[PDB]
Amino acid sequence: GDVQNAVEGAMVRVADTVQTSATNSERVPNLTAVETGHTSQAVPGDTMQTRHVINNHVRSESTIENFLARSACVFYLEYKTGTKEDSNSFNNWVITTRRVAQLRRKLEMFTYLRFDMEITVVITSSQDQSTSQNQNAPVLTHQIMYVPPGGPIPVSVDDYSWQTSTNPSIFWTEGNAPARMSIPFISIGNAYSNFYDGWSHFSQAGVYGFTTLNNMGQLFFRHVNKPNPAAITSVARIYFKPKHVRAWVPRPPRLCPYINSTNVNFEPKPVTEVRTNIITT
Amino acid sequence: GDVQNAVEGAMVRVADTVQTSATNSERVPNLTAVETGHTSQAVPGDTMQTRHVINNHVRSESTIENFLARSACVFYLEYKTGTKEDSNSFNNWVITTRRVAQLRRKLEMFTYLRFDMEITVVITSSQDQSTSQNQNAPVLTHQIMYVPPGGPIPVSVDDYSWQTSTNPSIFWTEGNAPARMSIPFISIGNAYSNFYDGWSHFSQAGVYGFTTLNNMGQLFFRHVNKPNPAAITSVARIYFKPKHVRAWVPRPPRLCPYINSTNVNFEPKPVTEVRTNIITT
Amino acid sequence: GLPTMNTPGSNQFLTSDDFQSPSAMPQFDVTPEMHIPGEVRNLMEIAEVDSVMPINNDSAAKVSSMEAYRVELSTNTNAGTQVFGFQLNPGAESVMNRTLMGEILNYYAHWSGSIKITFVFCGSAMTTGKFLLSYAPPGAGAPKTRKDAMLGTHVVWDVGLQSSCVLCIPWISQTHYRFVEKDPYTNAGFVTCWYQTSVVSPASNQPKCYMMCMVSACNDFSVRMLRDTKFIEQTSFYQ
Amino acid sequence: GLPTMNTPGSNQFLTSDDFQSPSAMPQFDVTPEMHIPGEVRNLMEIAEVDSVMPINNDSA
Amino acid sequence: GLPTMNTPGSNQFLTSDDFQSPSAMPQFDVTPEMHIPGEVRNLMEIAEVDSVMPINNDSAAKVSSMEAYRVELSTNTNAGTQVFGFQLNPGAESVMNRTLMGEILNYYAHWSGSIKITFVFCGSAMTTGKFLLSYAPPGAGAPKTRKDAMLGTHVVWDVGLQSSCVLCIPWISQTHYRFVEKDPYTNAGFVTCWYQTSVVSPASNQPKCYMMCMVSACNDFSVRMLRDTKFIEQTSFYQ
Amino acid sequence: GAQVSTQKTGAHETSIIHYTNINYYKDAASNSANRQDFTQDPGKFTEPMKDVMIKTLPALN
Amino acid sequence: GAQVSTQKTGAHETSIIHYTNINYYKDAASNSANRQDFTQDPGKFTEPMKDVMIKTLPALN
Amino acid sequence: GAQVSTQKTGAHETSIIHYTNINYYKDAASNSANRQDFTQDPGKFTEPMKDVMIKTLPALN
Amino acid sequence: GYSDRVRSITLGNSTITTQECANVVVGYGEWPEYLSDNEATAEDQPTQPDVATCRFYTLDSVQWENGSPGWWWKFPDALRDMGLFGQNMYYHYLGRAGYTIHVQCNASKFHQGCILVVCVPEAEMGSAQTSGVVNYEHISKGEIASRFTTTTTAEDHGVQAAVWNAGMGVGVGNLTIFPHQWINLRTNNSATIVMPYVNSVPMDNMYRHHNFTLMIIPFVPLDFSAGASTYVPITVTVAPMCAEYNGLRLAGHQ
Numbered sequence A, B: 001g002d003v004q005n006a007v008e009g010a011m012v013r014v015a016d017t018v019q020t021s022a023t024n025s026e027r028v029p030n031l032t033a034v035e036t037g038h039t040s041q042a043v044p045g046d047t048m049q050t051r052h053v054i055n056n057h058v059r060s061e062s063t064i065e066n067f068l069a070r071s072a073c074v075f076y077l078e079y080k081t082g083t084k085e086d087s088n089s090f091n092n093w094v095i096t097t098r099r100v101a102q103l104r105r106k107l108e109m110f111t112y113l114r115f116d117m118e119i120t121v122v123i124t125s126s127q128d129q130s131t132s133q134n135q136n137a138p139v140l141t142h143q144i145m146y147v148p149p150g151g152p153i154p155v156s157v158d159d160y161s162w163q164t165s166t167n168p169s170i171f172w173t174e175g176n177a178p179a180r181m182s183i184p185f186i187s188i189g190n191a192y193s194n195f196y197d198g199w200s201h202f203s204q205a206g207v208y209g210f211t212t213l214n215n216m217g218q219l220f221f222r223h224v225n226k227p228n229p230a231a232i233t234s235v236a237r238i239y240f241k242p243k244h245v246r247a248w249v250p251r252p253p254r255l256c257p258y259i260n261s262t263n264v265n266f267e268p269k270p271v272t273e274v275r276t277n278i279i280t281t
Numbered sequence C, E: 001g002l003p004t005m006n007t008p009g010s011n012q013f014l015t016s017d018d019f020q021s022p023s024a025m026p027q028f029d030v031t032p033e034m035h036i037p038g039e040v041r042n043l044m045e046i047a048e049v050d051s052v053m054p055i056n057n058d059s060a061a062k063v064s065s066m067e068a069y070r071v072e073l074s075t076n077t078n079a080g081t082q083v084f085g086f087q088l089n090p091g092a093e094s095v096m097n098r099t100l101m102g103e104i105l106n107y108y109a110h111w112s113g114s115i116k117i118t119f120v121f122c123g124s125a126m127t128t129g130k131f132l133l134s135y136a137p138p139g140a141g142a143p144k145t146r147k148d149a150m151l152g153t154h155v156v157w158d159v160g161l162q163s164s165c166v167l168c169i170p171w172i173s174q175t176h177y178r179f180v181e182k183d184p185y186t187n188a189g190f191v192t193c194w195y196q197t198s199v200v201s202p203a204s205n206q207p208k209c210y211m212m213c214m215v216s217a218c219n220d221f222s223v224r225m226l227r228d229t230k231f232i233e234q235t236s237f238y239q
Numbered sequence D: 001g002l003p004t005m006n007t008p009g010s011n012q013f014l015t016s017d018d019f020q021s022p023s024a025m026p027q028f029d030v031t032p033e034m035h036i037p038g039e040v041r042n043l044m045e046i047a048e049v050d051s052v053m054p055i056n057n058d059s060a
Numbered sequence F, G, H: 001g002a003q004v005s006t007q008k009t010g011a012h013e014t015s016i017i018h019y020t021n022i023n024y025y026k027d028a029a030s031n032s033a034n035r036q037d038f039t040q041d042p043g044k045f046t047e048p049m050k051d052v053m054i055k056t057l058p059a060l061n
Numbered sequence I: 001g002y003s004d005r006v007r008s009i010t011l012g013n014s015t016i017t018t019q020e021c022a023n024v025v026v027g028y029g030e031w032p033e034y035l036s037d038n039e040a041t042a043e044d045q046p047t048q049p050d051v052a053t054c055r056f057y058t059l060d061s062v063q064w065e066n067g068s069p070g071w072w073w074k075f076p077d078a079l080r081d082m083g084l085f086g087q088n089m090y091y092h093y094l095g096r097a098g099y100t101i102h103v104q105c106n107a108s109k110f111h112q113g114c115i116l117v118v119c120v121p122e123a124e125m126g127s128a129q130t131s132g133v134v135n136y137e138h139i140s141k142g143e144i145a146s147r148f149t150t151t152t153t154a155e156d157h158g159v160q161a162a163v164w165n166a167g168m169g170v171g172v173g174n175l176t177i178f179p180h181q182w183i184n185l186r187t188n189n190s191a192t193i194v195m196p197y198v199n200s201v202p203m204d205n206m207y208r209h210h211n212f213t214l215m216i217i218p219f220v221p222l223d224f225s226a227g228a229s230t231y232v233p234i235t236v237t238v239a240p241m242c243a244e245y246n247g248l249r250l251a252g253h254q
C-alpha cells in the first residue's frame, strides 16, 4: 500500500457472527494455555450457540493515520514588538514532541514511527498596557524561520540570520488564515524513534535516552514590523499533524505522569483505580 | 533539458557499492599522480573488499536550482508618510545582489549565472510616535516602481514619474498577501556575470570589476495615501529567488568577509581554524 | 462565481514555495543562449573535485600562510611514528572543514557517502619511504599506536614514481546519513597517518621534505536538509 | 481572473481537516524505507492482544 | 466549496499584468471595422523610416532653426578636411537622439542592430565632390585624421546623378544588445565624415553648398526593456 | 491527471459515491492523509507462535 | 493542455504518484522552479584530461 | 472549450512550452492583451513607391 | 614504444618538447574552436590570421626561490606585445581566442618543491587598501610576472596579493576547482593547460577584459642542499588557438 498516495484505500469490515448449534464433543476451543504467549482467537460461537449477524462495522477511526492525523498543539512561544536592545523582541523553540502531554502519549504508544507532517501555526497578538496603548498600530507581519542543525542562530531581533538565504521561512500577516506547511520524513534513520534505551557515548555514557536521537533543529520567531509607541505581545502556537504514517512495535500507554521533556522519567503510580470490594456492581 | 519547463525532470540516483573480493595483482587503482590535474575516481572497493550496497539516495537538494531557488532577502528600504516637502516621504534602491552577505556568497560560487527570478516584497508599517499617534489611519496602499536604465527618476513623492506610462509598477494595499513578480533573464549578455576581471574603459581604466557589467536599474518606493496627522513609517523588504537556473565555472566560496557592495575587496583571513596539535581526536 | 473555499496556508509567503507568478516584463525577448564551458548543474560536482587540506594546522601563524597545506616529513624518523591524526567530521573538523567538499557540506545539515584522501609526496625525487594510511571506525577511540591503526581500514603507501596514493574512506555507519555538524550519535571515527618504515635519502639530499593531502567526495556521496552557512555574516548592508 | 466566490468555512483551521499544503523542504530525498518487525496499522490490533486485569483491586 | 489556497501576489495591481476583467458595458455592438490606410503594428516600422539628422548642432541659435539639419560644405576646401564627427549613441547622442529612430529608442532601455546613414548632396547640380564616410568601432578613440578614419569601416562617396549615398553601419559589438542610455561598457564607436578629394565648382556657381543626412534602422534592428521616456514631463495636470 | 476515488458512506438498508483528487504539489509529502486504508494484521501480536495453535485442539499435548 | 508529472516520493520497502501542472501565464519566466532535474557531469571538473586516465593503470609510464 | 497556446521562451543553445486559456466572460473586450502577434509591414512607410525601387539599380535613370 | 611522459606540441612555426609531462588538461573538457554562425553577433567578416597569431610565445621567465610566494599573468593582456597576436589585438575592437599554456620548470632528482599551475577565469582581484580601488599597473605588467605577496600590505592601489587568499578573498587550497596542473619537481618538468574561450559573451575587447589569470603558486617550497645548483627558473610559453578578430579601425588604446 502507499501511505503517501492518500486516494487509495482498502475497505476491511469487521467479522460476522456465524450461527452456532449445540455441541457435545472432544474439541475444546476455550481451553488453552496462556503460558504459550498466545492470545485466544475465540469467537462467542465457541462457547454459546449464536445467531447469524452480519457486521458491516469497519475499524475506520482506529487506523494509525486517523488516530494520529488530527492536528495537535505541541508548544507555544511568546515575543514582544521591540528593538535590538530588547531581548524579548524575538524568541525560539527547539523542536520536540515531548513538551506537551497529550500528543506525546499518542505517539509514544509506538516505539518507531515514520511519517510526513503538516505544521499549522496560530500566531496571536495583544496590546500591552501603556500610556500609549491608544496608538494606531498597523497590521503586523510575522517571521517564522527554521534553522536546521548546524546553521546560524539569530542573536537579535535584527540580524543577518533573518535573511534566510537558504533556511526555510514563513512570512505571515495578521487577520489571514493560519500559516501551514508540509514536512517530509526528516530523519537520518529509517524511522523516528520515540525511545532509545542507549547512550550518546560508546563508553556507556553522556546522554541517556531518546534525546540523543531526536535532533530536529529549531524555530525562530519575530515581528517584521518596526515597533509602535506602545508594545504589542505576540504568541505563536505550533500545531503538528502526523500524516502518511507508519508505526512499529506497539507499547503500553504511559501510566505515570510525564515529568521532563528531556527524559523518560516518572515517579511510581498505582496500576489502576481502587474499588470498594472485589465483588462490585 | 529545458530549465523553464519545470514539470520535466531527470531521476539520477547515487552509485551502488559493488562487492569486492581479495586481490594480488599488477593493477593499482589507488596509486596515481596529482600533478596531472586529475581527481582520483576511486571507489572503496579498490582498496577494501566491500559488500553489495544498493544506494537509492539521490542528489536532490544539491541541484543548482534547489540550492538557489529558495527566496532570500537582498535589501530593505525605508519611507515615511509625507508631503512634497518631506525628502523622506519616498525612497529608492539601485538593484544589486552584492548588498547582503548570504545570497551573495551563494551566487558567487559560480562565475556566470543565467536565470529567471521571482521577486517577492514584504512591506511593513509602523506608527511614528506623536501627539497625534491616536489617529484613525486608513489602510495604506503602496507603490513600487521599476525604473529601467535610462528612464526618469522621481524627484519627489509626488511627480509625473509615478504615472508609469511605460515603467512596471506594483500597487499593493496592506493586510494582503506579499506582492510578487517574475522577471525574465534581463541581461544584454548571454549570462549574468558575478565577476569581471576588467575595466569600464578601453584604456585599462575607469571602474574595475563586476560593477561595470551589472547595471540593473532601480526600484522606487512610496505611499499612495495622503498623510494622516501623525506620521507612519514603512519598510520594504525585497526578496529574490533565482528560478530556471543555469550555472557556469564553479569557484571557491568566499573565505574572507565582504566589505564593499561596489567591489570584490577583502582583507586577508586565515585559511582555516587553528587546532591544538597536528594529532587530534 | 465558482464557489471557492480558502484553506489554511492562504496568503502566507513561504521562502521555499514553488508557485507561478505574473512577469513584470511581458513578451521579453531574452538574450539568445550561448555555449559557455564548465557548466555546474549540481553542487556535488564541486565536492567531487580534489581540494588540498590544511592538515598542518598547528598555529595562527601557519594557518595564515602556505605552511597549513604542507605536512612535514623527515629522514631517519623512527618506524611506528605518527604523522598526524584527527576525527573524520567533513564540514566540521578544521582539517577538511573549509575545503571545496567542506564548504559545500556547510550549506546542508545531513551528509552521506565515501570520502577519498589523496596523499601526495612532494619530497626529493631521489628520496624514499613507506607510510600507513589509516581509518578507524568509531566506538574504540583514536588509534594510539601504529598497531592500533593497522587493525582498522588501511593502505600501506609505498612512495615511488606514482607520486600519490589515495586512502579511500568507506561509508561505514549505523545510519544512512550523518549530521554535517559534530554530533555524538553521528560520529564517523578517525583518520590517522604513520611511518610504516621511514623516509630515507642519499648523501647531498635534504633531510626534511613534505607530503600534501587532497580530499574529495566519491560517487556515493550526497547531502540533505538545506541550511544557511555559519561561514559568512554581516552587521549592516555593504556599500 | 477566473470568477471565484469564497464560501463559509473559508480561512478557518479545523484540527481534523484533510487538505494539501506546500512542503517547506522541496525535493527532499527521504531516508530509504527499511523493514522493521512489528508493524501496527490499526489500534484494534493492540486491543486484540491479551492484557492481565487488576481484579484484586481492594486497596491502594 | 472547492478548497482554494491563495498564493503570494494575491490582490496586487501590477501595471504590466495581463488578466481578464468584466466589461462595464455588456453586449456592446462596437462600430464596424473599416480599412484606414497606414497601419502601424510595430514601432520598429517607424524606426525603419528615414528621418533627417540635426548634425549642424553647434548653437542654440541654429538648433531652433532649419540650419540644424544642413551641414555646410565648401569649394576649394583642402583634401583631408573633416566635415563632422560624433560617437554613435542612437537615442542618446544629440545628432541622432530625437529623430524617429531616436525617439522610438527612448521608450526602451536596450537596443540592437545596424543603422544606415543616408548622405544626400543638396549642392548645385553643376557642382562635384568626393567624401570619405567613416565608422570606427570602439577601443581606439575617435579617428583624428582621414587616414585614421580610412582604416575603419568606410564608404568613399562620389557625388553625381544619384544624389545620395548610404553609409551602412554594421552591428559590431561584444554583446547581443547595447543600452539606449550612454554606458562605457556598451560603447558603439564613432561615425565621422571627411573630404576624400574636395568640392569643385564652375565659374558663376555658389562656393558654399550643403549636404544633409538621413538616418534609419536596418532589418536587423530591435529594442528591449520597455521604459518611460525622459523627453516629456509635467508638474501638474493639463487643462 | 485526476484521480477518482470512493467516499466513506455507510451500510445501506437492504452505496458508491465518488470524490475527485488532483495533487497540486511536486512533493508527495504535501498530499492528503492516508485515511482510507482499513488494512490489518493482529497476527504478529495476537499469535507470534512458531508452531501453529489450532483453536479446537488442546494447547498442550 | 494539462501536464502530468511525477512527485518526489522515496525508496520503498521491497513508488509512482503524480501531480498536475497547468501553465497560467504567457511567459515561460512565470513558471515553477526546475527542481526535478537530477542530472550531472562532474567529468569536466574531476577529469579535464586530454589523454584518458584509466584507473587500474599507473598514471605515469 | 479550452485554448492551448505557446509561451514566450527564448533561443536555446544548439524550445516549445505551452499555456492554457479559458475565456470566462461573454464579451471579447474582456479578454487578455494581444501580445503575441509579432507581425509587421514597414513597406507602407519605408517604401510607398508606385514604381518598384530595385536596390542594385540606380534610383534614377 | 610511446612513453606517456614524452610529448611534442606543434603550433604554427613552433614546437615544444617535454620528456617529463603529466598528461595535458583541456579546460573544462573543451578544446578551442572558432565562433559559430549561431553564436555570433558582430556582423562583419572576422580576420583569422591562423599561423601568424596562433603560435608559441615565450613570456619573460621568472626565478623560483625557496621563499618566493608566487606569480600571476593576465590573458590576453600578457600577449599585448607578442608579435602579430599583439598587433591584431591592437587594431581590433573585438577579439576571441583559446590558448595552449605551457609552463616549464626543470631541476634534478636531488631537488624538491611543488608548484600549482592554474588558469583562473575572471579572477577579479581585491584592492589591498579595502577602502580604496585597485589600478591596472598593479593588476598586470603585461608579459612580466606580477608577484604574490607573503606580506599583508602594498603601495597605493596595489592588489592584496597575500598568497593564502589568492588575491581574491578565497582559500588558495581551493583554486584547484579551476583548470590546473602541478609541477612537482620529483614527478615532472612541465605543465600544459589547453584553455577554451570561457566568457559570458561571444567576443570581447582584448584590452579591457582580462578573461583569465595564470597563477603559479608554490605549495611546497623550493629546496635542495649543499652546493646543488641554486638557480632554477620557471618559464611560461603560451600559444593562442582559434584566434579571430572583429571590428577593425586604427591603432587602439584611446
Ligand SMILES: CCCCCCCCCCCCCCCC(=O)O
Residues within 6 Å of the ligand: A095, A097, A098, A107, A117, A119, A144, A145, A146, A168, A169, A170, A181, A183, A186, A192, A193, A194, A214, A216, D024
Ligand atoms: C518555516 C519552516 C518550518 C520547517 C519546520 C521543520 C520542522 C521539523 C519537524 C520535525 C518533527 C519531528 C517529529 C519527531 C517525532 C518523535 O520522534 O517524537
Ligand SMILES: CCCCCCCCCCCCCCCC(=O)O
Residues within 6 Å of the ligand: B095, B097, B098, B107, B117, B119, B144, B145, B146, B168, B169, B170, B181, B183, B186, B192, B193, B194, B214, B216, C024
Ligand atoms: C515592479 C516591477 C519590478 C521589476 C523589477 C526588475 C528587477 C530586475 C532584477 C535584476 C536581477 C539581476 C540579478 C543579477 C545577479 C548577479 O549577477 O549578481
Ligand SMILES: *C(=O)CCCCCCCCCCCCC
Residues within 6 Å of the ligand: F001, F002, F022, F023, F024, G002, G003, G004, G019, G020, G021, G022
Ligand atoms: C490531469 O491532471 C488533467 C485532468 C484535468 C485537469 C483539470 C485541472 C484543474 C485545474 C488546474 C489544477 C492545477 C494545479 C497546479
Ligand SMILES: *C(=O)CCCCCCCCCCCCC
Residues within 6 Å of the ligand: G001, G002, G022, G023, G024, H002, H003, H004, H019, H020, H021, H022
Ligand atoms: C488543457 O489545458 C485543457 C485541459 C483542461 C483544462 C482545465 C483548465 C482549468 C481551469 C482554467 C485554468 C486557466 C488558466 C488561464
Ligand SMILES: *C(=O)CCCCCCCCCCCCC
Residues within 6 Å of the ligand: D002, H001, H002, H022, H023, H024
Ligand atoms: C471547454 O471549455 C471545456 C474544457 C474543460 C473546462 C474546465 C473549466 C474550468 C472551470 C470552469 C471555468 C468556467 C468559467 C465560467
